[PDB]
Each structure stands twice: as structure tokens, then as C-alpha cells.
Assembly symmetry: C2
Homo-oligomer: 279 residues x 2
């Protein structure tokens, strides 16, 4: 069955089987006055693969602007008279709304890149490189090596795991709600909704275990005592390997847009909670 809702103030509630008639979300809490259209949501949906099933805004937008009421989303499944991009669509469409709002309001920029596929690691990050290749890889000299590895596993009936880093930049200080709703805790919660995820870490993450107590190197990954620092938010996740020519070697790279979406959803929620706690 389902726990089909996430968030306290920015709340997303969903339903829909991948094989069922369609998929739906109700998104609460988005302030009035955000420019929004179907296109703004499709753009992020269509980033899962880099004419597919089209999202429709059913409510909450009048004359191209959010009204402040609950926003209803629908995808009608054109299953032609079990691909799990349909299981991820409402999350990504809803994250898109949170992204667009956080970008306009604060200039928050949320972006993910694959740092590792199996035994190949990316060693350096160039944000202009991540859309040029189909791995979301920021290291233009690792792309060939990732491609060779994918070519290699495709041949031999196997698949590999991955590790993604997601960053949220320009996030105001103060967001998060200790004891139980720390920003890191809700992040980890949200990331762990993505299917093959086996770990989440913030900042230096598991390395920390072997550390001893570098200037402003953001060891905390932008969260301290469960509340945003002001620094960039760094989150990493590890996705496990996944079970005609099915061209399936590393599905985990295609999780980048949804990990971006989940981080946006959590930040949007905590934005609103922080605001509610300040008037």
C-alpha cells in the first residue's frame, strides 16, 4: 500500500500505479505569485532521460501565476492500447515547483552530479560539463571511462552501483527543526525514498569516522546542529546495482533529477517553517 504524503507546510500528496490510469499529486503551501506552467514541470520530468507522458496542472494557477491554493497535478498514462520513471514523476514535477520558487526568492541552486559508477570515479567538477554527457558527470575526462564501463557491462549481462552528490547553493542560514526535524534528518529521509539508495551522508559524511578534531572547507556540508549554515549544502547518496537488448547498466545516474527534486521539496518545506517561526 502507501505512505503517500511528505512535508508539514510544503506538502506533497500522491497516488497512481505505473500501470494504472494515471498519476496525481496535490501540492500544498506554495505562496501566490510564482510564475508557473506545465512546461516548467515537463523540463525537469524530461531530464530523467538525457512524445513522453505529459503533466497537466489541474488547479492552483490562475493566469500563469500560483494562486496560493493547492496545486493539483495529473499525468494520464498512455500505456499504449513496467517502467519506473512513472513511479518518480510526481516527485520530480513537485520538486520543480519548489526549485523554481527557491531560485527566484533566494537564488538557491540545486544541482546533482554522478561522482562514481562502479570502479570509475570522477575527480573534478565542471558544472558546464554535466549536461554535455548522459552520466551527469562533471569530469569531462571521466566521461569516456564511464562510457567504456557502461559499454563493458552492457556486453556481459551486468550492472553497477553509483554515487551521486547533490548540492544546494545560496541556502539561507537558519533552516531546520531540531530535535526530530533537523534539516539533515529530513534530507536523509527524503533521499531514502529513491529506490536503490543504501546510504545518505552530509558534508564529509562517512570519512568523518576516521577524522580527528583546512579553512572554510565545509566539513559539515552546510548543516550544523541540524540547521543550515549559510554554506553550500552537500549531500551524497549511494545507489545499489539494479536488475531484446535491454540497455540497463547504470540506472542510478538517472536518479540525479529526483535527488535534486527531493532536496528542493525538503528545503521548500523548511523555508516555510522558518518563516512561520519568525513573524
Amino acid at each position: 500500500m502507501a505512505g503517500n504524503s511528505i512535508g508539514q507546510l510544503f506538502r506533497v500528496t500522491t497516488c497512481g500505479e505505473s500501470h494504472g490510469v494515471g498519476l496525481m499529486a496535490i501540492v500544498d503551501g506554495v505562496p501566490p505569485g510564482l510564475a508557473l506552467t506545465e512546461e516548467d514541470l515537463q523540463k525537469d520530468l524530461d531530464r530523467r532521460k538525457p512524445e513522453p507522458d505529459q503533466v497537466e496542472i489541474i488547479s492552483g494557477v490562475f493566469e500563469g501565476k500560483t494562486t496560493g491554493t493547492p496545486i493539483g497535478l495529473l499525468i494520464r498514462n498512455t500505456d499504449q492500447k513496467r517502467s519506473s520513471a512513472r513511479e518518480t514523476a510526481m516527485r520530480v514535477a513537485a520538486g520543480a515547483i519548489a526549485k523554481k520558487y527557491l531560485a527566484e526568492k533566494f537564488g538557491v541552486l540545486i544541482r546533482g552530479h554522478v561522482t562514481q559508477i562502479g570502479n570509475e570515479v570522477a575527480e573534478k567538477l565542471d558544472w558546464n560539463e554535466v549536461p554535455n554527457n548522459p552520466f551527469f558527470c562533471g569530469d569531462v575526462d571521466a566521461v569516456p571511462r564511464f562510457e567504456a564501463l557502461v559499454t563493458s557491462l552492457r556486453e556481459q549481462g551486468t550492472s553497477c552501483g553509483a554515487k551521486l552528490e547533490i548540492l544546494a547553493e545560496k541556502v539561507p542560514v537558519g533552516w531546520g527543526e531540531p530535535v526530530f526535524d533537523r534539516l539533515d534528518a529530513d534530507i536523509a529521509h527524503a533521499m531514502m525514498s529513491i529506490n536503490a539508495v543504501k546510504g545518505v551522508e552530509i558534508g564529509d559524511g562517512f570519512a568523518v569516522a576516521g577524522q580527528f578534531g583546512g579553512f572554510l572547507a565545509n566539513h559539515a556540508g552546510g548543516i550544523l546542529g541540524g540547521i543550515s549554515s549559510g554554506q553550500t549544502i552537500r549531500v551524497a547518496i549511494a545507489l545499489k546495482p539494479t536488475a531484446k537488448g535491454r540497455h540497463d547498466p547504470c540506472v542510478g545516474v538517472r536518479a540525479t533529477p529526483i535527488a535534486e527534486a527531493m532536496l528542493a521539496i525538503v528545503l521548500m518545506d523548511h523555508f516555510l517553517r522558518h518563516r512561520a517561526q519568525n513573524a
Copy 2:
């Protein structure tokens, strides 16, 4: 300090400052008929230290048994007309309740051990050893090395990180609520309430990124598609270094009881949700 509640059906709500008058919790959802007394809670409280302040049960127990009504817990702070074990007390007391219930009902066994302090790692696990030393260490040949490392770092005035593994055994299959309240997701959420945690992983965890695709080797750590497998639940967390003879080189080992508590709280919650969902 607004997020003072956790759980949907097994719900724990807390309050209290460390130099306020006292600390409180209200714990909802525990069925009637569990044998329970202050002592059962103190035992777990006093495990934070491998004269002192005593938890009191205010409601929800009659003639030594839970009634099924909300259980109120109080600790009056005897400040003596400087320790942070106070902000962790209500979580551990309440986890103790979830623990006892899950042990009597299903024989569930939730235990944690420190696998790593800084540059020292434990190899072997012997549950009998873990209470014999003050590191919750399961390797009797590592205890000396952990003691040496810690003795040094206190005299040097340096702190080190740690890594804990928490296991939940004999957990029934079926528990957890995808999409957004998967068991692993609520585990991670809960573990990250513990201050100093920078990562949570389930099963093989971050190793998974470097893997390629008997089966009963818990690669998944007892959770598959966000729901319990029947296998042992394996969770690891990494705690960062902190910063008269009260210098805390690795305060992270003392997190073992609270990580046990948090895992108990989440399991208890998902037990009840699972029960509610079956008609």
C-alpha cells in the same frame, strides 16, 4: 526548538531545556498489557555511561502494566540549586518502551556496537564483549587499541570520530510505508536526530556504489523496496569529532544507546502502522 515530536502511531512528543526545571515526554500508541516500570527506563538511561537524575512515569501504567493511554514521563533536573545527556534522556526512555514491547511481542533484539574510533577499527563481533568495556566494542582484541587511542587523544586534547553499527534482529517482514515513509527512510531520519551524525547507511551502504550485479547475505541490511525482509536490520552511522577530567575525545561511543533507542522508536511506529493497515 520546534520539532518536538516523532512518529505517526507510536508518537513521542518532548520538551525541556537542559537547565530548565525538567524534561518531559508524552508517548502515544503503546498497547495495553506491557509490564513497565521506572526501572525498565532507568536501565537504558544509565547505559549512556558505561546521583543520577531519575525518570518518573506519570501516566499510562496501572499495577505495573501499560493501560493503552498516553504515557507521561518526567525528569526533574536536580541542577544542584555540566552535561548534555539531558537532551537525549526522553528519547532513550521512550525507546526503552518500544524496545521492551518489541522484545516481548516478537523477540526483536536491537543492539549497537562501535566498529571504529578514529584510525582504530574493530574486526570481530562478540555480543558478550560489548558490555565488558566502555566503548561498546565487540572485539576484545580492539578494546586495548581503542583504550590506547583514547588515552592519547585526551592528553593531546584531540577528538576523533566514530562509526556505530546498530542491528535489529527477528524483525517481521512487511514493515514500512513507501513512497515517503519507507522503513529505511524513517530509520535515517531518526538516526540523524543524534547530534554529530554525518551519514546513515543500510546494509552494505556506501560500498554499494562500487559494486556490480547465498542471496541471504544481507546486502540490503534487512530492507527491500523500503519494507522489512525478515532478515536482520543493519544500520551504520558515522559521528564526527567534537570540540576537571571531563574532556570527551570520542563522545560518539556514548551514542550507541540512543541509536538503539531511535531504531526501536521507528520499528515500534511501523509495527503499529502495519497492524492498522491489515484488515
